[PDB]
């Protein structure tokens, strides 16, 4: 919610690669940030901080749509998708896949149907979409396709290729068991090529040292007709020397430790510590046995259909390749001609390779060179003879490998249906950055530099097609040209000669050394943009797309030498061994590995530039093959190498976040509330009105036909202001509802109509106490939280809605509660005095009512008596009654007038009614008693007269 108020950024993290942090303060070139996780303040460099995407860009399916295009945002987007079960993620053209090390239900036959004919944006990212779009582009555009897969895992890349083939075997097959045979044979060709083409390096225990191009052939109607395997850029130099902790190709160790004693004898095999070509001896591969893998390799060849005598030819040549390194030449006394005092190694080489030892010895020591018309024998130094033997071993192993690829295609492409189109799957060793980068790493990084240039150009063509569809002017040079200077730094023959050209020149001079080669690179190429001096064992640095790479030019001269002895090549072409003769059937030296590498790569790049390229990036999540565990630095390292971040750099420089007109207006109209009329229909002009209301610089946006194209970070800022504006609306809406409640409650508390009853007044007390217990506290909390929101909103206001005005309005409410409760207590005391007076008033009357009634009953008897004294006795009680009434009359009337006077002080309504009730009683009841009292007295006198008359007689 309040994410825009935290100023969240990405800072480097040792544990998690990057982590969120709240930017607090900048001090010059450094910034103070607060780490979200533990709240500790650290100081970091401002150029180490990377912008963070808004939460709306959560688990985006295409990371080219991120508004903040950096490596910290790419890692975060990949991490969240991975832990949510999503291993596929598009990054522009790339299809990034992170190995889940699990069996996911995403490769079902029902999901294959959901991807047929669908576009990338219509479905979640998946290898099926890459395969479908490539297949549909093959049939619509009628041009061949290529799928370039990188990754440093023989398990992840192979499982991705298996999915590509399965999708093609389902969507383009005409007939099941026959529907998976193409995959069945390919899974048998993988171990065969692996033993001869893969090797343990200092960074990968099973690194493929060649490029595999699996072509799926199709007829003119789109049905699969067959498949074959092409290979490129075999690292043949690995056969003669390897770096520390590194092995040559697997097959050498399989044969040396996996062969029985009879095969050892027949192949003249020797222990590990007698072959110079095995630099480090029997380096083992963890969790694997060279002895055991030998059977599996031979097993796969039997399954493939390769006969016994052809497998023996491969083992025999392997033994011959090793024996060449055992030949020792020595410089003789005071003569530059090389000598070979011991011919034991040559006898074994000549026996294993089916040639004559004397022809071989004479052909390396004193070879014939055709001068004019005749063969002229020329001397050879020890160095020339050594390089010739090494070049012969490298060339033989390459010819043996290429023969094996042809032999496997003979099993695969058995029908040779010859299709009209193909989809090629390229599996090449990706970019390599070791602690010590040598000649091999330069050749590898040279290859991937041109492969990444194939990507940048492909993205350039497609992006140029998008801008023209939207009518937006295209003013960009080719994205592949950004990598051209680094490529020309390495490959350019002349003009500014490349590093490979400079190396060739040193290899052709006598006095030249490794130091003199570095001197020529420093002085002739230190001015190059992509060239840098190291800062320090390395000799020079190259700025690849994957960043700066340091190189050490140790032994580069000898590594670049590749002079094929045409004399020995003729001997091997004329070998008596039928297998060796087959390896050297196409034969016929200023010949270098670097120049031979350029041509091989040119053969590959020609193959690829004649196809439509697709790109899939396989990433290892962790080194423990665990599931659901992600190594952030391991992923970051691969992201820097595979060119994912290079594509992210490209669209970061252009307009990467394209937004449809109606979507842009719906999202950001809160920022532009009064610039679009109410009956406005043109959605394109509405965005023009919104952008004009935001003062966005014309360099930040491009208006298209259906979308508006924005630079990077533009949507990040608008999203920030959107959250900043909707939190303001939530404040104003809540502030109005709070003040209107306070005004209404105060207007209610100011009321003084508390009813005219004791139960009426006490009910409003219970309402006032229930208000202060249940209704008031929730509003008081709103006062505090709104003030907190306003102060937060003010750092990153209609009258009455500022915290200072709400605080005063709330105080007037508490003052209204003050007088309300006091007024109720005044009224409750008033209601009780009335009730007590009314009860005491009606008490006096009821006392007089029964007194007026009962005494009138006694008077009604008119008892005079029977004697004169008894009549006067009746007069005694009558005057007592008369004097008693005079006291009871004035006493009650005085108390009744007092109660009426007190009720007038309290402003009682029914005072005139009470006064009438008293005046009625005295005029009716009470005067009737006083009237009946005198009638009795007159009765007591009429009898008192006649009773005295009787006595006188």
Author numbering: 24 to 198, 201 to 560, 564 to 616, 642 to 849, 860 to 1016
Could you pull the original sentences from the published paper?
Nonmuscle myosin 2A (NM2A) is the predominant myosin isoform in nonmuscle cells. Together with its paralogues NM2B and NM2C, NM2A enables tension and force generation, driving essential cellular processes such as membrane protrusion and retraction, directed migration, adhesion, and cytokinesis. pmcMyosins are molecular motors that convert ATP-derived chemical energy into mechanical force. The motor domain, which drives ATP hydrolysis, is composed of the N-terminal Src homology 3 (SH3)-like subdomain, the upper 50 kDa domain (U50), the lower 50 kDa domain (L50), and the converter.
Here, we present the crystal structure of the NM2A motor domain fused to an artificial lever arm in its nucleotide-free state, resolved to a resolution of up to 2.0 Å. The fusion construct, comprising the NM2A motor domain linked to the artificial lever arm, was produced in Spodoptera frugiperda (Sf9) cells, purified and used for crystal setups with commercial screens. Multiple conditions produced crystals, with one condition further optimized to the final condition consisting of 16% PEG3350 and 240 mM Na-thiocyanate. The resulting crystal belonged to the space group P212121 and diffracted to nearly 2.0 Å resolution. The final model includes the conserved myosin motor domain, which comprises the SH3 domain (SH3), upper 50 kDa domain (U50), lower 50 kDa domain (L50) and converter fused to the artificial lever arm. Since NM2A crystallized in its nucleotide-free state, neither ATP nor ADP was observed in the nucleotide binding pocket. The root mean square deviation (RMSD) between NM2A and NM2B is 1.77 Å, whereas the RMSD between NM2A and NM2C is significantly higher at 9.98 Å. This large disparity is primarily due to differences in nucleotide state, which influence the opening of the cleft between the L50 and U50 domains and lead to substantial translocation of the transducer region. We present the first high-resolution crystal structure of the NM2A motor domain, which demonstrates significant structural conservation with NM2B. Mapping of known MYH9-related disease mutation sites reveals that K373 is situated near actin-binding loops, optimally positioned to influence coupling between the actin and nucleotide binding sites.
